[PDB]
């Protein structure tokens, strides 16, 4: 559901 860290993403 939600994108708590995806790696290269701001």
Do not use: C, D, R
Given at each position: ?10
């Amino acid at each position: 559901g939600n994108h708590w860290a995806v790696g290269h993403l701001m």
